[PDB]
RNA sequence: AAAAUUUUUUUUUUUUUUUUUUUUUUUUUUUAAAUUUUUUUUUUUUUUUUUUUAAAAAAAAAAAAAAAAAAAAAAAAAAAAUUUUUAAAAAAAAAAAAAAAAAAAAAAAUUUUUUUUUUUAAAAAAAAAAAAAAAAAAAAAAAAAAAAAAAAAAAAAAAAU
């Protein structure tokens, strides 16, 4: 049934109904206990993070996918959110993303370092530095984070 | 601002694959189909004549069969308001594989239609190969998942203020 669900999700995404596709996938997981393949989750995460869908509240659904996808045993996607944060991501959504991935208030230092590097590589030193205001001291006083903010300076 | 990390193990999902099995598709081998008239030329039979080589051909006559050239008629088509010309109508669209173009989303992830080419109009037996499905696993893992573990602080239970 997983291949059929994958084809159904692709058909709904191709018919401009990604918002309905997320609701259908959530209803099928909660009610009928489907276990979709990783490619379906990849397609849903990639399609929900487009510019028009994300501005209409799609980012909350794409963020809530990660606990649901984590429940089945899948690894959480890190790559597709970087492209969204490099263009129009906000710090309030960034801290929610960095806290919704795991339960111990943050992942390891490498994920936050990758977020800072991705938001620095697109000449955005405002929200990238303001996101450092919302994290505790062990990231703020870490030598690697201060080094990364000292290399890709706005100068 | 204050107070209220170290090692190792793997699980997903990978990255290729190793082997085995099944199915679809394809290739290979053998197998079901059958108009008339005049002139000229060709072939089987009979006898005679001549020539040639170690056994054949050619010349003449007769009998029988077929094809081509010319004429007439029949049939079919086009032009003008009579003339010319000579194996027949075509079940075909869908499906299958590959390539290109178009539009609308991403722009270099995962959809569509159109156009072009090939095939299907194909059945029994035999054999292998590509794709899909199922399984164990042979090697590299970020982050998630844990344990021991530099933790520390608060509470509870048990042994020797």
Curated annotation (Swiss-Prot):
Regions that span the bilayer: none
PPR repeats: 1-36, 42-76
Source organism, top-level taxon: Eukaryota
SS bond list: none
Compartments (UniProt record): Mitochondrion
Quaternary structure (record): Component of the mitochondrial ribosome small subunit.
Record family assignment: Belongs to the PPR family. P subfamily.
Protein name as catalogued: Small ribosomal subunit protein mS81 (rPPR8)
Organism: Arabidopsis thaliana (Mouse-ear cress)
Portion of the full-length sequence here: 502 to 656 of 668
């Amino acid at each position: 049934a997983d291949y059929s669900f994958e084809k159904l999700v692709l058909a709904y995404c191709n018919k401009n109904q990604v918002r309905d596709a997320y609701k259908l996938l959530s209803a099928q997981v909660t009610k009928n206990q489907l276990k979709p393949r990783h490619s379906t989750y990849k397609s849903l995460v990639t399609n929900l993070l487009t510019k028009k869908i994300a501005r209409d509240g799609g980012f909350e659904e794409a963020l809530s996918l990660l606990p649901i996808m984590k429940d089945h045993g899948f690894p959480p996607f890190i790559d597709p959110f970087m492209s969204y944060f490099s263009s129009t991501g906000k710090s309030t959504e960034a801290l929610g993303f960095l806290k919704a991935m795991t339960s111990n208030n943050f992942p390891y230092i490498s994920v936050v370092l990758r977020v800072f590097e991705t938001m620095m590589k697109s000449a955005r030193h405002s929200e990238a530095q303001d996101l450092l205001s919302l994290c505790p001291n062990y990231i703020r006083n870490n030598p690697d984070v201060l080094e990364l903010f000292n290399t890709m300076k706005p100068n």
